[PDB]
Design a protein around this nucleic acid. Structure first.
Lengths: 137, 77, 94, 58
RNA sequence: UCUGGUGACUAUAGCAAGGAGGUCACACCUGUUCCCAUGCCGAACACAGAAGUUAAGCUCCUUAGCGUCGAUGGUAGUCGAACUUACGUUCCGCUAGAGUAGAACGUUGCCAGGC
RNA sequence: UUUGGCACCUCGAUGUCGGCUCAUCGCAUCCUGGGGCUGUAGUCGGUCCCAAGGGUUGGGCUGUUCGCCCAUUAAAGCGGU
RNA sequence: UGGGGCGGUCGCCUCCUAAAAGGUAACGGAGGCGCUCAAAGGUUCCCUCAGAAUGGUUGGAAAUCAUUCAUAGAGUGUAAA
RNA sequence: GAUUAUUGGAGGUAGAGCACUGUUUGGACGAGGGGCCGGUUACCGAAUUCAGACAAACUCCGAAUGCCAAUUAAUUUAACUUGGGAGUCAGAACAUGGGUGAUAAGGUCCGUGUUCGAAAGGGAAACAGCCCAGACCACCAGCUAAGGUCCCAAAAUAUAUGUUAAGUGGAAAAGGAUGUGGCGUUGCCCAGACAACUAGGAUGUUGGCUUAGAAGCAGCCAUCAUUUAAAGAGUGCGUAAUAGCUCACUAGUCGAGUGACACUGCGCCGAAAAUGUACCGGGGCUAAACAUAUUACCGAAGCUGUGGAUUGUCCUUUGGACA
């Protein structure tokens, strides 16, 4: 249920997935976060699942930031049909994550509660992950 | 169906001579829309904004202000 | 407040930079007033130990060659995916 | 100031710029050689095609 | 040979702030008779003046305050090669953008008066 | 083991669905369970091993691979073949 | 014409795909044209940004009016560059 | 005509990265509809001050490409021009480079490659879709190029050195455990590292809301002095409650090792499917897997032995002298 309000173009090219992440490689908002170690597309039902799982374990405790937003539409053909009579209708929205990138951050909670929340969130996501803290030094 | 199979025939814009090469007295140096390059010494500007030489000599692309460019043609032979 | 440094000689290639990072070294520059720019290398664990006791914004008397310089950390490049410091800048404050 | 260049790898499968550089150095069939004097031009040609040739002083 | 006209250079040349100043200059200033003029208006343009004035413009001197410039080093990326087509790796060339240190309150041509 | 692609032979022809007859490569198994472990009292449930070792029905109803009832039985896959 | 049919199409202009020049395909992604203009042409010349706040009879809170910052963010007959 | 170095431009190239912007997002701030009496507030909308995304339909830069100049060097005697004669337009197919579109396509562009068809071949099981070839052309030259080296079947039984253990070889995958170790670690103790040993297990104290009492446990602690070298308003196992032993502690015994990293290369379920095994072709083997070398040389349209072709350049000897 994250999706933009308007786009300029409903059909877009699909993102490149090679490389390391351009920005957002640091926890800047909370105390802890969840970092990605491989590359995937993340589809905003995965975001909604991983946010719901993480919230109810915290029992409305601390706060949670989502550092990932799905801007890009993706299309698919609805039934399996002949090849190519134009592009299909838009199906969902993706963000693209590459290794380095923080996916979620939490604050206002103890460390082991945060570890358990981020582990429960990470079992919903299609990417490998790593619990991290604020950098210092 | 779709509604998207139109295009236009590409016009062959861009540079037609090089910096440093000798041109004769009326030849087309640059084809563009607008003035990406301005005309300098001995270079005239056509009505479709074609930049052409007015004498024969060596073409020099140089800068114009902080951020503009111009072509001049010097007569040296 | 007593790091030791070794002057890197000219033109480290890409291979020996990562070969040097495979050891416990980190490349570094020293610039500021009092000196020219000197390309040095620094042991990593020692630098972490100095930083842990002197603070992030501290003063370090590090030795280049013969002389010692009072110096503060200007910036540093960090590799967040494997948590190692990968380059460090030294600003001579005198 | 002299160089001996021997073409040791073949030219089949290689790109056409590299075949043209191998030809301008004067090499013909594999294990054929040429003696040329040293320039930075000649060395640029050796550097373009150095995975195909072998060079020694002589 | 200080200004002032007038050219050349990518704002290193600009904005802001603070302080000084004046008939060889320079502007505000005073007016509408006349040339001329405002889709109304001497505001502007134009003309005739020269009582006032350094306040403002302008000049000169201080600031790095905002813009502008900006290395060294180290990274992205990439030509070629070798592994292998791993969301790759390795070797060798070219080395960015950003950001740090630091620059910078302009040099220079011609002319005439003042000298 | 319905779609995509073809086109990668066959327009100088590779016989299409049911049914019968005969199998069997030969496999995540209905029965026996042969065994066994548990959020298994016998009776179940569920899982594991084992198995295609051996077995795995006669009728009423159709247009055909689809189904549906009657009456049994220890019991009524998997289709490339 | 990812068999053929049905559907959708013949031309021109502008972007994007399009990978230092230029060129470049698809039933790939988006838009226009099939004119207009007696000044919206020429020319000496002349003369020469909105919006934002600000605060005002009007006040749509803003129409016109006034001060200062405002990039051609305004404007450019017509789509985009 | 060319082909290959330095210097100059063009594109503002893209890859990257954000130079105003245009769009899209999670920052945090007082005013306006408004909640109300024309405002008091909330929420909204808009405005000013952190961190992201496109920049396929963007702005500040610039690998390789391309255009060109040299009164500038190695290569090809070919060039471009005119004329005669064509084939080809399934021209494709495997190959990216980058990309579109269903990321199969053994479908669409494009930048080089390989065959190519006539270049057949020869060592990529054998394959006009890796190493090698263009051709004088043969031929018992014998010696090279590599892709190479039990049996096949040129060619290291092929060793030597120090690290490997799935038939990986000769099949990748999500989580789960203990894997060769390993250094870069980091930090744990003769008052004896993890020891295990077993000897202390409490208490006013559930004190409180006391919740089906619950006195480790409906769930909120109010979470206070201890006995002792040592122990919890009891680590905890539990528990309808107790039964609570230790994993909260140390003198009896007492030795050499411990917790987190990072992983780093290489191990442990997948590998459940059917005429026919199984990918060096493959049987057979641990070399016939990592890192180093190391001489061996094999080896073919490569050198050097023989030879009936022709072309070019030279002399002009028209020899075939060299090519």
């Amino acid at each position: 249920m994250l999706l933009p309000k308007r786009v300029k173009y409903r059909r877009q090219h699909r993102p490149k997935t090679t490389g390391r992440s351009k920005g957002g490689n640091y926890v800047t908002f909370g105390e802890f976060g969840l970092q990605a170690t491989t590359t995937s597309w993340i589809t905003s039902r995965q975001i909604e699942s991983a946010r719901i799982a993480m919230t109810r374990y915290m029992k409305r405790g601390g706060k949670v930031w989502i550092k990932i937003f799905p801007h890009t539409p993706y299309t698919k053909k609805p039934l399996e049909v002949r090849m190519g009579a134009g592009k299909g209708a838009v199906e969902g929205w993706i963000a693209v994550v590459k290794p380095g990138r923080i996916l979620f951050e939490v604050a206002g909670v103890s460390e082991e509660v945060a570890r358990e929340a981020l582990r429960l969130a990470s079992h919903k996501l299609p990417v490998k992950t790593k619990f991290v803290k604020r950098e210092e030094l | 169906s779709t509604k998207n199979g139109r295009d236009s025939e590409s016009k062959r814009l861009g540079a037609k001579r090089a910096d440093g090469q000798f041109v004769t007295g009326g030849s087309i140096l640059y084809r563009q829309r607008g003035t990406k390059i301005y005309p300098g010494e001995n270079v005239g500007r056509g009505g479709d904004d074609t930049l052409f030489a007015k004498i024969d000599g060596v073409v020099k692309f140089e800068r114009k202000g902080r951020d503009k460019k111009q072509v001049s043609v010097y007569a040296v032979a | 407040a007593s790091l030791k440094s070794i002057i890197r000689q000219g033109k480290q290639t890409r291979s020996d930079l990562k070969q040097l990072r495979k050891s416990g070294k980190v490349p570094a520059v020293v610039y500021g007033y009092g000196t020219k720019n000197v390309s040095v290398k620094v042991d990593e664990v020692e630098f972490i130990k100095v930083i842990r006791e002197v603070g992030r914004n501290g003063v370090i008397e590090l030795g280049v060659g013969s002389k010692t310089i009072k110096v503060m950390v200007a910036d540093y490049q960090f590799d967040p995916l494997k948590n190692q410091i990968t380059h460090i800048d030294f600003l001579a404050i005198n | 100031a002299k160089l001996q260049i021997t073409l040791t790898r073949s030219v089949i499968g290689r790109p056409e710029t590299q075949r043209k550089t191998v030809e301008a150095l004067g090499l013909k069939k594999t294990n054929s050689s040429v003696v040329v004097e040293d320039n930075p031009a000649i060395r640029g040609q050796i550097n373009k095609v150095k995975h195909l040739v072998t060079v020694e002083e002589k």
